């Protein structure tokens, strides 16, 4: 198991660590989170009690370094940093562990939620969407725009998702206008899967990362990206049967995890109704269709 230490908690803050949320009071003796399960990316995120503006957080992987959190009173946020002195680090963590100043990530042995939401997510691909190369972890927040959004404004602070646009020359072969527009299989399988992503696991990784960024930071661009990538598969007549079975599972656990009070803004009625009831793959998402009907029948 591994750990993320905090010099301190100077401002009252709601801290998130993957799908868990808990509150820290101004100057309560909090020094961090222990027993984080090795083997998965993680995300530690923040919402200041006093200013709900800007949810922000950090994507990291404990196998890539020793990371800690220290509040920066100039920039006004909890910053992630890497301690290169491994020995300084174990010493510090042991002290706080001994004094029991760390809350305990409760890994449950009948819960696969986090695995099921991050199966295809890999820190190396995150670091290509979020460009900040002198760090092994990746900052995201509420307001970061995506490359595509900055085509319709600082590029350093943007999310480089793979642009998808159904009415572009990339999506539409000359002389196959109607064919490619009503059946997107060319765009899915040759352009995106064989061309850009190389395999379906990197496509699913971006799709999952997109969803998590929407859900955890309320990032509007990420939400668009997550729907765009669902729609491209659902709108293709020809999709490997393994992709559909897996897509069904992925969405199911996304739908399962979404807070009920946030579905009116994070789910796009058009995309889902099309995908579940009109698209080529209408019959192919049984598990997703069952949880969507039973949980958010309102949306349909």
């Amino acid at each position: 198991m591994n750990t993320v230490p905090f010099t301190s908690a100077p401002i009252e803050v709601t801290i998130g660590i993957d799908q868990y949320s808990f509150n820290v009071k101004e100057n309560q003796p909090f020094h961090g989170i222990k027993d984080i399960p090795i083997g998965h990316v993680h995300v530690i995120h923040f919402q200041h009690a006093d200013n709900s503006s800007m949810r922000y957080g950090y994507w990291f992987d404990c196998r890539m370094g020793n990371f800690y959190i220290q509040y920066d009173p100039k920039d006004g946020l909890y910053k992630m940093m890497e301690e290169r002195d491994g020995a300084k680090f174990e010493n510090i963590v042991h002290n706080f562990k001994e004094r029991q100043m760390m809350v305990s990530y409760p890994k449950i042995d009948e819960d696969d939620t986090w695995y099921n939401l991050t199966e295809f997510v890999q820190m190396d691909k995150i670091r290509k969407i979020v460009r900040k190369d002198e760090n092994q972890f990746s900052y995201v927040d509420s307001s970061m725009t995506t490359v595509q959004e900055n085509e319709l404004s600082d590029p350093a602070h943007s999310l480089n998702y793979t642009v998808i646009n159904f009415k572009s020359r990339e999506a539409i072969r000359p002389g196959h206008e109607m064919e490619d527009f009503l059946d997107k299989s060319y765009y899915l399988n040759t352009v995106m899967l064989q061309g850009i992503f190389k395999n379906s696991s990197n496509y699913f990784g971006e799709l999952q990362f997109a969803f998590l960024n929407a859900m955890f930071f309320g990032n509007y661009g990420s939400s668009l990206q997550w729907h765009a990538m669902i729609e491209l598969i659902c709108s293709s007549a020809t999709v490997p049967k393994h992709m559909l079975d897996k897509l069904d599972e992925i969405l199911y656990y996304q739908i399962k995890t979404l807070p009920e009070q946030y579905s009116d803004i994070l789910l796009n009625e058009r995309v889902w109704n099309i995908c579940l009831y009109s698209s080529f793959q209408k019959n192919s998402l049984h598990n997703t269709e069952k949880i969507m009907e039973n949980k958010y029948p309102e949306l349909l």
């Binding site: 009415k167 572009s168 020359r169 539409i172 000359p174 206008e177 109607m178 527009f181």
Partner: protein, 237 residues
């Protein structure tokens, strides 16, 4: 965006623009089969592509062979229209290409946009106007060339005959739309009005008769009365 009664003068400024109407592209007659089912039989149609400023009409004739062995014909019609328009634009020299293409029905917007991705500076737009262009097949010489056609064929016309020598495009357009609405609402009466006087005649190189200015006023008056008459008949007034 969309075109309406607020920016109605835009049609007659100096930016090349075309209307595209696909209503008469796919045309069918419906009849009973021997076994008592219903079957369709397609007939020739046409794409109606009009420059409202000059009166130039690019009448692309749609031969029934186009449909042979195809599925989902009403939807293909929209994509066949978009392809024809796109090919027409591409055959025009650059300085003759439209800046705008206005489609008369919203279902045409995506097919045309996708076919025109190569032309990112050409705006593709809907209109809130209800334009009576479906009645173009009530014009006899257009109906004639469409039904006679044995093959795909592009035929060029000026739907204003010579009117622009004497009036503005704004007025020619008004007259054309009033004539076409009349023909759509009651085609037989509309035509009677145009040939009730046997002395006035249609030049072989025209579509509409050779009315004096004074006779056009009278005609215009009679067409408005017809539309009004049909409105009353319709709603009981």
């Amino acid at each position: 965006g969309a075109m309406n009664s607020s920016n109605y003068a835009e049609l007659f400024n100096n930016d090349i623009k075309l209307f595209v109407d696909d209503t008469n592209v796919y045309r069918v007659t419906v009849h009973k089969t021997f076994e008592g089912n219903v079957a369709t039989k397609a007939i020739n149609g046409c794409i109606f592509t009009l420059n409202p400023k000059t009166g130039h009409l690019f009448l692309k004739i749609i031969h029934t062979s186009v449909w042979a062995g195809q599925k989902r014909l009403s939807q293909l019609a929209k994509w066949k229209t978009a392809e024809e328009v796109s090919a027409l634009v591409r055959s025009l020299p650059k300085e003759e290409q439209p800046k705008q293409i206005i489609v008369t029905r919203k279902a045409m917007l995506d097919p045309l946009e996708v076919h025109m991705l190569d032309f990112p500076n050409i705006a593709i737009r809907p209109t809130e106007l209800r334009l009576p262009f479906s009645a173009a097949m009530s014009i006899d010489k257009l109906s004639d060339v469409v039904m006679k056609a044995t093959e795909p064929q592009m035929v060029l016309f000026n739907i204003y005959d010579d009117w622009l020598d004497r009036i503005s495009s704004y007025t020619a357009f008004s007259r054309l739309t009033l004539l076409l609405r009349a023909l759509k609402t009651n085609e037989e009466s509309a035509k009677m009005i145009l040939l009730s006087d046997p002395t006035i005649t249609i030049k072989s190189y025209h579509l509409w008769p050779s009315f004096t200015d004074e006779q056009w006023i009278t005609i215009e008056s009679q067409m408005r009365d017809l539309i009004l008459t049909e409105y009353g008949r319709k709603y009981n007034v």
